[PDB]
Amino acid sequence: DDKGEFCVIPKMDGQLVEKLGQRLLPWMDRLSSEQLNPSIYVGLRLSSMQAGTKENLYLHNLKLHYQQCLLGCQTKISGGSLALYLLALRANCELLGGDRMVSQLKWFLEDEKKAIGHHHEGHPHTSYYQYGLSILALCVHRKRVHDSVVGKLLYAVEHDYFTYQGHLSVDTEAMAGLAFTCLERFNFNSDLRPRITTAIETVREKILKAQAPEGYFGNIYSTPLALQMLMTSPGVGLGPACLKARKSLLLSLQDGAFQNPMMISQLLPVLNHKTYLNLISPDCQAPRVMLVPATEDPVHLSEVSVTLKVSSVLPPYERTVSVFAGASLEDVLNRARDLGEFTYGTQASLSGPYLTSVLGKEAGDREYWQLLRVPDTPLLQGIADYKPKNGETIELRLVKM
Ligand code: B12
Ligand SMILES: N[C@@H](CCC(=O)N[C@@H](CS)C(=O)NCC(=O)O)C(=O)O
Ligand SMILES: [Cl-]
Ligand SMILES: [Cl-]
């Protein structure tokens, strides 16, 4: 590739990548319906690493869970979650399909298309991220959806719906590009083909323009999906752009990034030069090294002082607490709660605990609790993974989606 047209990530530190995989390994034993994440299975299968027989047991439990929750299930499965399960099936070389899951995912897309409306003036009940992910998951199972469904996602890309105040929301843009790439390879939605092929170029160009001087695309956690999109096909400047991203990824791993299992599961494929598009026709005898358990570090003795602020409740709340150095924001919330007259609530997600209430105020429709480093810098990690530094002030703020 003397011309530098292929997006590659060469010469990654072997032990940083091993340790990244070892962070997923313990999660292979968390098999309850409340903790299963099909993206973990996909990410491991597309990676240079494996967990042996634990993978087969994980897939067995995924199958029982998604089969039980088709419309003894406990919580309603979103379209995107079912889509990730479809990706897990392809990672084991299994093909669906009148399949009930295929139909359920198609009807999810129909519901979201209706929410968006004929004038693209509405919004999905979930997100354009889940919309694109669901189109992609159907496509890799060789299943087409109606042009009217695909048109909504094309329109959003064509009208730059995922750029806000000049900043591209890279993850959703990249996911849309992955879906479009799959449609193009099957020649699905052929009446939309010129739009599809241009939109692939638009996504790639917008991703490249979102590259920061440091080398990440948007932010370090959007970079895995951005790299998937760039790796689907060679292009001018991709070699050089992806070498900058390599530098950013290495520095981030050295600095302790990528603790979150969902994020690890998005990064592992691209470190192995694979993407979700490999799930059309995947190698199911891929070369992968067995992971072994990491050794856990000694107890952290130092402490950090962190101020927790909530101004979207009446009366507002502010308290400085101390926790062990390396404790999470969740630990800070727990310490504040222990000190009295502070409460919070969460719900499970495939990314871990999602903050849903603070001081008795539950996020309503189209609202969420945003986590910020004062002043006004949104955190890049959620409560379980963000580790506050001494002297930081963290704000919880209820905002409109
Ligand atoms: C859509 C989305 C949101 C929406 C979710 C609501 C909706 N309308 O669906 C909104 C805008 C509310 C949101 C909020 C946040 N998000 Co967000 N989000 C995403 C996105 C684009 C897609 C998620 C999705 O649908 N996945 C597919 C479905 C099937 O999976 P799921 O687990 O069932 O989806 C749920 C969770 O993702 C959850 N949620 C969304 N984001 C986050 C982040 C964390 C850490 C957790 C625990 C949960 C959570 O909401 C989804 C719907 O219920 C991802 C992109 C990505 N690369 O994954 C980023 C992403 C997951 N979010 C991220 C972050 C950091 C946040 C926030 C912490 C930002 C902040 N500073 O407040 C908050 C969450 C705080 C809290 N209250 O706990 C990061 C996480 C990185 C990491 N290291 O883990 C990502 C990767 C984006 C990025 N590149 O920065 N998010
Ligand atoms: N509107 C988009 C989602 C945009 C979005 O919620 N982006 C959040 C996700 S946490 C974000 O701030 N992303 C980081 C960024 O844009 O840099 C969709 O429908 O998929
Ligand atoms: Cl992380
Ligand atoms: Cl609460």
Short mmCIF file of C-alpha atoms and ligand atoms in Angstrom, two decimals:
data_model
loop_
_atom_site.label_atom_id
_atom_site.label_comp_id
_atom_site.label_asym_id
_atom_site.label_seq_id
_atom_site.Cartn_x
_atom_site.Cartn_y
_atom_site.Cartn_z
CA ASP A 1 0.00 0.00 0.00
CA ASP A 2 2.73 2.46 -1.06
CA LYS A 3 0.00 5.03 -1.77
CA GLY A 4 -1.41 5.18 1.76
CA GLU A 5 -5.01 4.45 0.81
CA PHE A 6 -5.81 1.78 3.42
CA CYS A 7 -6.85 2.58 6.98
CA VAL A 8 -4.51 0.48 9.13
CA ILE A 9 -3.42 0.52 12.78
CA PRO A 10 0.05 -1.07 12.74
CA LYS A 11 2.54 -1.62 15.53
CA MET A 12 0.23 -1.47 18.51
CA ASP A 13 1.81 -2.31 21.83
CA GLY A 14 1.15 -5.98 22.43
CA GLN A 15 0.65 -5.73 26.15
CA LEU A 16 -1.64 -2.69 26.01
CA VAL A 17 -3.88 -4.62 23.61
CA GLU A 18 -3.74 -7.79 25.73
CA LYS A 19 -4.72 -5.86 28.86
CA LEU A 20 -7.58 -4.29 26.92
CA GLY A 21 -8.89 -7.77 26.13
CA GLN A 22 -8.32 -8.97 29.69
CA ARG A 23 -10.72 -6.22 30.85
CA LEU A 24 -13.51 -7.97 28.95
CA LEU A 25 -12.70 -11.46 30.18
CA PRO A 26 -14.38 -11.16 33.63
CA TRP A 27 -17.60 -9.97 32.00
CA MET A 28 -17.85 -13.30 30.18
CA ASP A 29 -19.03 -14.78 33.50
CA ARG A 30 -21.82 -12.20 34.02
CA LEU A 31 -24.43 -14.23 32.17
CA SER A 32 -27.71 -13.01 33.65
CA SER A 33 -30.37 -11.55 31.37
CA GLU A 34 -29.75 -8.28 33.20
CA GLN A 35 -26.07 -8.14 32.20
CA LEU A 36 -25.70 -9.95 28.85
CA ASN A 37 -24.36 -7.72 26.08
CA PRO A 38 -24.26 -9.16 22.54
CA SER A 39 -21.74 -6.50 21.51
CA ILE A 40 -19.16 -8.14 23.82
CA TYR A 41 -19.51 -11.40 21.89
CA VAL A 42 -19.22 -9.65 18.52
CA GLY A 43 -16.23 -7.63 19.64
CA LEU A 44 -14.35 -10.66 20.92
CA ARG A 45 -15.09 -12.74 17.79
CA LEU A 46 -13.82 -9.95 15.50
CA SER A 47 -10.72 -9.40 17.68
CA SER A 48 -7.28 -10.99 17.82
CA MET A 49 -8.22 -12.57 21.17
CA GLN A 50 -10.64 -15.18 22.47
CA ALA A 51 -12.20 -16.58 25.63
CA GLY A 52 -12.56 -20.21 24.55
CA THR A 53 -15.53 -22.15 25.88
CA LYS A 54 -16.75 -19.07 27.74
CA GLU A 55 -17.77 -17.67 24.37
CA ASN A 56 -20.00 -20.61 23.53
CA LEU A 57 -21.73 -20.36 26.90
CA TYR A 58 -22.16 -16.61 26.42
CA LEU A 59 -23.81 -17.18 23.04
CA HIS A 60 -26.05 -19.90 24.48
CA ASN A 61 -27.26 -17.46 27.13
CA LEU A 62 -27.70 -14.67 24.56
CA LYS A 63 -29.92 -16.97 22.49
CA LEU A 64 -32.11 -17.89 25.45
CA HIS A 65 -32.44 -14.23 26.45
CA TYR A 66 -33.36 -12.81 23.03
CA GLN A 67 -35.69 -15.74 22.29
CA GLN A 68 -37.49 -15.22 25.61
CA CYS A 69 -37.92 -11.47 25.03
CA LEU A 70 -39.57 -11.69 21.60
CA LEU A 71 -42.81 -9.69 21.56
CA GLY A 72 -40.71 -14.74 30.81
CA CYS A 73 -38.78 -11.64 29.81
CA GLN A 74 -38.09 -8.91 32.38
CA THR A 75 -37.46 -5.68 30.41
CA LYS A 76 -38.48 -4.73 26.88
CA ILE A 77 -35.67 -5.20 24.34
CA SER A 78 -35.02 -2.20 22.12
CA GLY A 79 -34.62 -2.48 18.37
CA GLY A 80 -30.92 -1.73 18.61
CA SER A 81 -30.36 -4.36 21.28
CA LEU A 82 -32.01 -6.98 19.06
CA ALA A 83 -29.85 -5.66 16.20
CA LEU A 84 -26.71 -6.32 18.24
CA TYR A 85 -27.97 -9.86 18.88
CA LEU A 86 -28.31 -10.31 15.10
CA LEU A 87 -24.68 -9.22 14.79
CA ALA A 88 -23.69 -11.80 17.41
CA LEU A 89 -25.40 -14.52 15.36
CA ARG A 90 -23.40 -13.54 12.28
CA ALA A 91 -20.21 -13.60 14.38
CA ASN A 92 -20.92 -17.33 14.81
CA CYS A 93 -21.72 -17.74 11.09
CA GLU A 94 -25.44 -18.19 11.77
CA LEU A 95 -28.09 -16.78 9.43
CA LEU A 96 -31.69 -15.95 10.28
CA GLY A 97 -34.48 -16.80 7.88
CA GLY A 98 -40.54 -16.16 8.18
CA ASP A 99 -38.30 -15.30 11.07
CA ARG A 100 -39.97 -13.56 14.01
CA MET A 101 -36.88 -11.61 15.04
CA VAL A 102 -36.36 -10.29 11.53
CA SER A 103 -39.98 -9.16 11.54
CA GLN A 104 -39.72 -7.55 14.98
CA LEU A 105 -36.68 -5.54 13.90
CA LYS A 106 -38.40 -4.46 10.67
CA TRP A 107 -41.43 -3.28 12.69
CA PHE A 108 -39.15 -1.33 15.06
CA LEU A 109 -37.84 0.53 12.01
CA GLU A 110 -41.41 1.11 10.81
CA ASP A 111 -42.31 2.60 14.19
CA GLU A 112 -39.27 4.87 14.10
CA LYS A 113 -40.00 5.93 10.51
CA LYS A 114 -43.50 6.90 11.64
CA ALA A 115 -42.06 8.90 14.55
CA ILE A 116 -39.76 10.78 12.15
CA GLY A 117 -42.74 11.51 9.91
CA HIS A 118 -43.23 12.38 6.26
CA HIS A 119 -41.48 15.77 6.63
CA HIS A 120 -38.53 14.45 8.70
CA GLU A 121 -39.86 16.89 11.33
CA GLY A 122 -40.17 14.35 14.15
CA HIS A 123 -37.50 12.37 15.95
CA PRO A 124 -36.93 8.65 16.56
CA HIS A 125 -38.14 7.33 19.90
CA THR A 126 -34.64 5.84 20.32
CA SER A 127 -32.01 7.40 18.05
CA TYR A 128 -30.72 7.53 14.50
CA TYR A 129 -27.86 5.42 15.92
CA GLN A 130 -30.24 2.55 16.67
CA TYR A 131 -32.02 3.16 13.34
CA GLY A 132 -28.81 2.73 11.34
CA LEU A 133 -27.63 -0.16 13.49
CA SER A 134 -30.92 -1.98 12.84
CA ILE A 135 -30.72 -1.46 9.06
CA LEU A 136 -27.15 -2.81 9.19
CA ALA A 137 -28.08 -5.85 11.27
CA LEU A 138 -30.87 -6.80 8.87
CA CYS A 139 -28.58 -6.23 5.89
CA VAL A 140 -25.84 -8.56 7.17
CA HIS A 141 -28.56 -11.23 7.47
CA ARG A 142 -29.42 -10.57 3.79
CA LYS A 143 -32.71 -8.87 4.70
CA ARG A 144 -33.90 -5.71 2.99
CA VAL A 145 -36.14 -2.98 4.34
CA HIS A 146 -38.43 -0.63 2.48
CA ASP A 147 -36.97 2.36 0.67
CA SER A 148 -39.09 4.66 2.86
CA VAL A 149 -37.18 3.40 5.92
CA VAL A 150 -33.74 3.90 4.37
CA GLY A 151 -34.70 7.32 3.00
CA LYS A 152 -35.09 8.76 6.48
CA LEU A 153 -31.47 7.95 7.35
CA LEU A 154 -30.17 9.20 4.00
CA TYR A 155 -32.07 12.45 4.50
CA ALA A 156 -30.49 12.96 7.93
CA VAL A 157 -26.97 12.50 6.56
CA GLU A 158 -27.70 14.67 3.52
CA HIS A 159 -28.98 17.49 5.74
CA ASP A 160 -26.15 17.18 8.27
CA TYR A 161 -28.51 16.27 11.10
CA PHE A 162 -25.60 14.95 13.23
CA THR A 163 -23.60 18.21 13.20
CA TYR A 164 -24.43 20.57 16.08
CA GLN A 165 -22.73 23.97 16.37
CA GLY A 166 -20.12 22.78 13.91
CA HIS A 167 -19.36 19.59 15.86
CA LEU A 168 -20.10 16.25 14.21
CA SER A 169 -21.61 13.51 16.36
CA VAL A 170 -19.30 10.93 14.86
CA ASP A 171 -20.76 7.70 16.26
CA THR A 172 -24.17 8.12 14.61
CA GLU A 173 -22.68 9.39 11.35
CA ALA A 174 -20.31 6.41 11.20
CA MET A 175 -23.05 3.90 12.01
CA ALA A 176 -25.16 5.33 9.19
CA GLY A 177 -22.20 4.91 6.85
CA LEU A 178 -21.81 1.27 7.91
CA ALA A 179 -25.47 0.60 7.13
CA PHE A 180 -25.20 2.34 3.76
CA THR A 181 -22.06 0.35 2.93
CA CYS A 182 -23.91 -2.92 3.53
CA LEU A 183 -26.84 -1.80 1.38
CA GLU A 184 -24.43 -0.86 -1.42
CA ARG A 185 -22.73 -4.26 -1.38
CA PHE A 186 -26.05 -6.05 -1.78
CA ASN A 187 -27.46 -3.45 -4.19
CA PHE A 188 -30.40 -3.18 -1.83
CA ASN A 189 -32.74 -0.19 -2.21
CA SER A 190 -31.53 0.26 -5.76
CA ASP A 191 -33.88 3.15 -6.51
CA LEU A 192 -31.89 5.03 -3.83
CA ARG A 193 -28.47 3.90 -5.07
CA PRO A 194 -26.99 7.29 -6.14
CA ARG A 195 -27.98 8.70 -2.75
CA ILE A 196 -26.52 5.69 -0.95
CA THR A 197 -23.16 5.90 -2.73
CA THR A 198 -22.88 9.66 -2.26
CA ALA A 199 -23.86 9.31 1.41
CA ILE A 200 -21.00 6.85 1.94
CA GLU A 201 -18.63 9.51 0.58
CA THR A 202 -20.32 12.21 2.68
CA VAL A 203 -19.91 10.16 5.86
CA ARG A 204 -16.25 9.42 5.13
CA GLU A 205 -15.52 13.07 4.35
CA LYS A 206 -17.33 14.33 7.45
CA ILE A 207 -15.47 11.82 9.64
CA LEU A 208 -12.14 12.96 8.21
CA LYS A 209 -13.09 16.59 8.90
CA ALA A 210 -13.96 15.70 12.50
CA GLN A 211 -10.38 14.50 13.08
CA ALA A 212 -8.79 16.47 15.90
CA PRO A 213 -5.10 17.45 15.83
CA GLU A 214 -4.52 14.69 18.39
CA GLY A 215 -5.81 12.10 15.89
CA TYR A 216 -9.16 10.97 17.29
CA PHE A 217 -12.38 11.48 15.30
CA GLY A 218 -14.78 13.55 17.39
CA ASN A 219 -13.61 11.99 20.64
CA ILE A 220 -11.59 8.95 21.57
CA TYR A 221 -14.75 6.85 22.14
CA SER A 222 -16.24 7.73 18.74
CA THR A 223 -12.95 6.71 17.11
CA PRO A 224 -13.64 2.94 16.97
CA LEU A 225 -16.81 3.35 14.90
CA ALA A 226 -15.16 6.05 12.79
CA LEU A 227 -12.31 3.63 12.07
CA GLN A 228 -14.79 0.91 11.13
CA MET A 229 -16.23 3.21 8.49
CA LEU A 230 -12.77 4.15 7.20
CA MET A 231 -11.65 0.51 7.10
CA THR A 232 -14.59 -0.63 4.97
CA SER A 233 -12.83 0.66 1.83
CA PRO A 234 -9.54 2.34 0.85
CA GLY A 235 -9.43 6.02 -0.05
CA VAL A 236 -7.22 9.05 -0.48
CA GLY A 237 -5.61 10.09 2.78
CA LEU A 238 -6.93 7.19 4.84
CA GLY A 239 -3.50 5.72 5.56
CA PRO A 240 -2.24 8.99 6.99
CA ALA A 241 -5.49 9.75 8.82
CA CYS A 242 -5.54 6.31 10.45
CA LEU A 243 -1.91 6.55 11.54
CA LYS A 244 -2.85 9.70 13.47
CA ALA A 245 -5.71 7.78 15.06
CA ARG A 246 -3.29 4.99 16.03
CA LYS A 247 -1.23 7.50 18.00
CA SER A 248 -4.35 8.74 19.79
CA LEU A 249 -5.48 5.20 20.63
CA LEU A 250 -2.07 4.23 22.00
CA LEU A 251 -1.86 7.31 24.20
CA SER A 252 -5.40 6.71 25.45
CA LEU A 253 -4.64 3.10 26.36
CA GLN A 254 -1.48 4.22 28.17
CA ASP A 255 -3.59 6.76 30.05
CA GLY A 256 -6.18 4.21 31.20
CA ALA A 257 -8.95 4.76 28.65
CA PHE A 258 -11.26 1.96 27.46
CA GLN A 259 -12.40 0.51 30.76
CA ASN A 260 -16.02 0.28 29.62
CA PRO A 261 -16.97 -3.12 28.13
CA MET A 262 -19.19 -1.69 25.37
CA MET A 263 -16.33 0.57 24.29
CA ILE A 264 -13.76 -2.22 24.43
CA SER A 265 -16.13 -4.25 22.26
CA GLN A 266 -16.19 -1.48 19.62
CA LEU A 267 -12.40 -1.00 19.70
CA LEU A 268 -11.29 -4.64 19.50
CA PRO A 269 -12.54 -5.30 15.95
CA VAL A 270 -10.72 -2.31 14.47
CA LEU A 271 -7.45 -3.13 16.22
CA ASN A 272 -7.76 -6.45 14.34
CA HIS A 273 -8.60 -4.64 11.07
CA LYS A 274 -12.17 -5.93 11.11
CA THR A 275 -15.52 -4.16 11.12
CA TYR A 276 -19.18 -5.07 11.34
CA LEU A 277 -19.11 -5.37 7.54
CA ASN A 278 -17.01 -8.52 8.03
CA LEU A 279 -20.23 -10.03 9.43
CA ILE A 280 -21.67 -10.38 5.92
CA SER A 281 -19.24 -13.24 5.18
CA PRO A 282 -17.16 -13.78 8.32
CA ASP A 283 -14.26 -16.07 9.06
CA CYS A 284 -15.45 -18.30 11.90
CA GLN A 285 -12.03 -19.96 12.20
CA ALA A 286 -10.15 -16.72 12.74
CA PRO A 287 -6.73 -16.82 14.44
CA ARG A 288 -7.24 -15.62 18.03
CA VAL A 289 -5.10 -15.98 21.16
CA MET A 290 -6.68 -17.20 24.40
CA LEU A 291 -7.00 -14.61 27.15
CA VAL A 292 -5.97 -15.40 30.72
CA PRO A 293 -7.03 -13.49 33.84
CA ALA A 294 -5.26 -10.33 34.87
CA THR A 295 -3.91 -9.85 38.37
CA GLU A 296 -5.71 -7.18 40.40
CA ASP A 297 -3.77 -4.21 41.73
CA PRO A 298 -3.14 -3.33 45.39
CA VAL A 299 -5.56 -1.17 47.35
CA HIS A 300 -5.42 2.54 46.52
CA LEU A 301 -4.39 4.39 49.69
CA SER A 302 -4.49 8.02 48.55
CA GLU A 303 -7.71 10.05 48.40
CA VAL A 304 -9.14 12.69 46.08
CA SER A 305 -11.48 15.56 46.98
CA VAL A 306 -14.39 16.06 44.56
CA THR A 307 -17.25 18.57 44.61
CA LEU A 308 -20.62 17.27 43.45
CA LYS A 309 -23.11 19.86 42.21
CA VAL A 310 -26.75 19.56 41.13
CA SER A 311 -28.43 22.82 40.08
CA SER A 312 -31.51 21.37 38.22
CA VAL A 313 -33.30 20.55 41.48
CA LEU A 314 -34.78 22.95 44.01
CA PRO A 315 -33.05 23.60 46.32
CA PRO A 316 -29.74 23.11 44.49
CA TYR A 317 -27.13 20.80 45.97
CA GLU A 318 -23.37 21.17 46.38
CA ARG A 319 -21.07 19.06 48.56
CA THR A 320 -17.34 18.32 48.53
CA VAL A 321 -16.50 14.73 49.48
CA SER A 322 -13.39 12.57 49.64
CA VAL A 323 -13.08 9.11 48.06
CA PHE A 324 -10.13 6.85 47.33
CA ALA A 325 -7.93 7.96 44.44
CA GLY A 326 -9.19 6.01 41.44
CA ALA A 327 -12.75 5.77 42.74
CA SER A 328 -15.50 6.36 40.22
CA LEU A 329 -18.11 9.07 39.94
CA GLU A 330 -20.60 6.43 41.10
CA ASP A 331 -18.48 6.07 44.24
CA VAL A 332 -18.64 9.86 44.69
CA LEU A 333 -22.43 9.72 44.42
CA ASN A 334 -22.49 6.92 46.99
CA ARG A 335 -20.32 8.92 49.39
CA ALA A 336 -22.59 11.96 49.04
CA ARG A 337 -25.59 9.71 49.68
CA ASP A 338 -23.88 8.22 52.74
CA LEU A 339 -23.41 11.75 54.12
CA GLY A 340 -27.17 12.27 53.98
CA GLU A 341 -29.99 14.04 52.14
CA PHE A 342 -28.71 13.09 48.68
CA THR A 343 -30.28 10.37 46.51
CA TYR A 344 -29.88 9.06 42.98
CA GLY A 345 -31.21 6.27 40.80
CA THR A 346 -29.98 4.33 37.80
CA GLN A 347 -31.14 1.84 35.19
CA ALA A 348 -29.17 -0.91 33.53
CA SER A 349 -27.89 -0.44 29.99
CA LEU A 350 -25.49 -2.27 27.71
CA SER A 351 -22.97 0.48 28.59
CA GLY A 352 -23.50 -0.05 32.32
CA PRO A 353 -25.37 2.01 34.91
CA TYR A 354 -27.27 4.90 33.30
CA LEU A 355 -28.14 7.76 35.66
CA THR A 356 -31.89 8.42 35.58
CA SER A 357 -32.82 10.28 38.78
CA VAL A 358 -31.09 12.69 41.14
CA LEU A 359 -32.56 14.04 44.37
CA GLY A 360 -35.92 12.52 43.51
CA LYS A 361 -36.12 14.07 40.03
CA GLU A 362 -36.48 11.42 37.31
CA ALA A 363 -35.58 12.29 33.75
CA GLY A 364 -38.75 12.53 31.69
CA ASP A 365 -39.38 11.96 28.02
CA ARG A 366 -36.64 13.46 25.85
CA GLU A 367 -34.57 14.48 28.89
CA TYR A 368 -31.44 13.07 30.45
CA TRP A 369 -29.03 13.69 33.28
CA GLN A 370 -25.82 15.00 31.73
CA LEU A 371 -22.50 14.63 33.57
CA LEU A 372 -20.15 17.60 33.34
CA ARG A 373 -16.77 18.75 34.56
CA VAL A 374 -17.37 22.33 35.69
CA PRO A 375 -17.35 24.59 33.70
CA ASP A 376 -19.51 23.00 31.07
CA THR A 377 -17.28 20.17 29.74
CA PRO A 378 -19.34 16.97 29.28
CA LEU A 379 -17.65 13.86 30.59
CA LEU A 380 -16.56 11.17 28.12
CA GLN A 381 -17.45 8.31 30.49
CA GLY A 382 -20.43 7.37 32.62
CA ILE A 383 -20.72 7.12 36.37
CA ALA A 384 -19.13 3.67 36.76
CA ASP A 385 -16.08 4.41 34.58
CA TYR A 386 -15.27 8.08 35.10
CA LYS A 387 -12.59 8.54 37.80
CA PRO A 388 -12.61 12.11 39.13
CA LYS A 389 -9.36 13.93 39.82
CA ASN A 390 -8.55 15.85 42.96
CA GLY A 391 -10.15 19.29 43.00
CA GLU A 392 -12.65 18.60 40.22
CA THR A 393 -16.25 19.74 40.43
CA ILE A 394 -18.72 17.42 38.71
CA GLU A 395 -22.19 18.71 37.85
CA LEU A 396 -25.29 16.60 37.20
CA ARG A 397 -27.67 18.58 35.02
CA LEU A 398 -31.06 17.61 33.59
CA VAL A 399 -31.09 18.59 29.94
CA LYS A 400 -33.26 18.15 26.88
CA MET A 401 -32.31 15.51 24.35
C1 B12 B 1 -27.78 7.64 21.86
C2 B12 B 1 -26.72 7.90 22.89
C3 B12 B 1 -27.02 8.67 23.99
C4 B12 B 1 -28.42 9.22 24.29
C5 B12 B 1 -29.25 8.07 24.86
C6 B12 B 1 -30.76 8.30 24.85
C7 B12 B 1 -31.41 7.85 23.56
N1 B12 B 1 -32.18 8.73 22.95
O1 B12 B 1 -31.24 6.71 23.13
C8 B12 B 1 -28.07 10.36 25.29
C9 B12 B 1 -27.80 11.69 24.57
C10 B12 B 1 -29.15 10.58 26.36
C11 B12 B 1 -26.74 9.91 25.84
C12 B12 B 1 -26.22 10.28 27.06
C13 B12 B 1 -24.97 9.99 27.53
N2 B12 B 1 -23.98 9.38 26.82
CO1 B12 B 1 -24.30 8.51 25.12
N3 B12 B 1 -24.38 7.65 23.45
C14 B12 B 1 -25.37 7.37 22.65
C15 B12 B 1 -24.92 6.57 21.44
C16 B12 B 1 -24.82 7.56 20.26
C17 B12 B 1 -25.79 5.36 21.01
C18 B12 B 1 -26.19 4.46 22.18
C19 B12 B 1 -27.08 3.35 21.69
O2 B12 B 1 -28.25 3.57 21.34
N4 B12 B 1 -26.53 2.14 21.63
C20 B12 B 1 -27.25 0.97 21.18
C21 B12 B 1 -28.24 0.41 22.24
C22 B12 B 1 -28.95 -0.81 21.71
O3 B12 B 1 -27.46 0.10 23.40
P1 B12 B 1 -28.02 0.41 24.83
O4 B12 B 1 -26.92 0.21 25.85
O5 B12 B 1 -29.26 -0.33 25.11
O6 B12 B 1 -28.32 1.96 24.64
C23 B12 B 1 -28.48 2.80 25.77
C24 B12 B 1 -27.18 3.27 26.40
O7 B12 B 1 -26.27 3.68 25.38
C25 B12 B 1 -27.66 4.52 27.13
N5 B12 B 1 -26.62 5.52 27.22
C26 B12 B 1 -26.26 6.36 26.21
N6 B12 B 1 -25.05 6.84 26.33
C27 B12 B 1 -24.56 6.24 27.48
C28 B12 B 1 -23.30 6.31 28.07
C29 B12 B 1 -23.02 5.56 29.21
C30 B12 B 1 -21.62 5.57 29.77
C31 B12 B 1 -24.02 4.75 29.78
C32 B12 B 1 -23.76 3.94 31.01
C33 B12 B 1 -25.28 4.68 29.19
C34 B12 B 1 -25.52 5.42 28.05
O8 B12 B 1 -28.74 5.04 26.39
C35 B12 B 1 -29.13 4.11 25.35
C36 B12 B 1 -30.63 4.06 25.24
O9 B12 B 1 -31.23 3.64 26.46
C37 B12 B 1 -23.54 6.06 21.93
C38 B12 B 1 -22.58 5.75 20.76
C39 B12 B 1 -21.74 4.49 20.87
N7 B12 B 1 -20.59 4.49 20.21
O10 B12 B 1 -22.13 3.52 21.52
C40 B12 B 1 -23.09 7.18 22.87
C41 B12 B 1 -22.14 6.93 24.07
C42 B12 B 1 -22.47 5.56 24.64
N8 B12 B 1 -22.52 7.91 25.10
C43 B12 B 1 -21.47 8.29 25.77
C44 B12 B 1 -21.56 9.19 26.92
C45 B12 B 1 -20.24 9.54 27.53
C46 B12 B 1 -22.76 9.63 27.43
C47 B12 B 1 -22.96 10.48 28.68
C48 B12 B 1 -22.16 9.98 29.90
C49 B12 B 1 -22.55 11.91 28.32
C50 B12 B 1 -22.62 12.86 29.52
N9 B12 B 1 -21.48 13.46 29.79
O11 B12 B 1 -23.65 13.04 30.18
C51 B12 B 1 -24.50 10.42 28.90
C52 B12 B 1 -25.05 9.42 29.93
C53 B12 B 1 -25.08 9.96 31.36
C54 B12 B 1 -26.08 9.19 32.20
N10 B12 B 1 -27.25 9.78 32.40
O12 B12 B 1 -25.81 8.07 32.64
C55 B12 B 1 -20.17 7.69 25.29
C56 B12 B 1 -19.69 6.59 26.24
C57 B12 B 1 -18.17 6.40 26.21
C58 B12 B 1 -17.66 5.45 27.27
N11 B12 B 1 -16.39 5.60 27.59
O13 B12 B 1 -18.39 4.61 27.79
C59 B12 B 1 -20.60 7.22 23.86
C60 B12 B 1 -19.79 6.03 23.32
C61 B12 B 1 -20.44 8.40 22.86
C62 B12 B 1 -19.06 9.00 22.75
N12 B12 B 1 -18.31 8.58 21.75
O14 B12 B 1 -18.67 9.83 23.57
N13 B12 B 1 -26.12 9.06 24.98
N1 LIG B 2 -29.06 12.68 17.36
C1 LIG B 2 -28.14 11.51 17.28
C2 LIG B 2 -27.42 11.28 18.61
C3 LIG B 2 -26.51 12.42 19.06
C4 LIG B 2 -26.09 12.21 20.49
O1 LIG B 2 -26.90 11.95 21.37
N2 LIG B 2 -24.79 12.37 20.74
C5 LIG B 2 -24.23 12.26 22.08
C6 LIG B 2 -24.15 10.81 22.51
S1 LIG B 2 -23.56 10.62 24.21
C7 LIG B 2 -22.87 12.94 22.17
O2 LIG B 2 -22.76 13.98 22.82
N3 LIG B 2 -21.87 12.42 21.46
C8 LIG B 2 -20.52 12.92 21.55
C9 LIG B 2 -20.15 13.83 20.39
O3 LIG B 2 -21.06 14.16 19.60
O4 LIG B 2 -18.96 14.18 20.31
C10 LIG B 2 -28.93 10.25 16.91
O5 LIG B 2 -30.16 10.39 16.75
O6 LIG B 2 -28.29 9.17 16.83
CL CL B 3 -14.04 3.73 29.14
CL CL B 4 -33.28 10.02 43.20
#
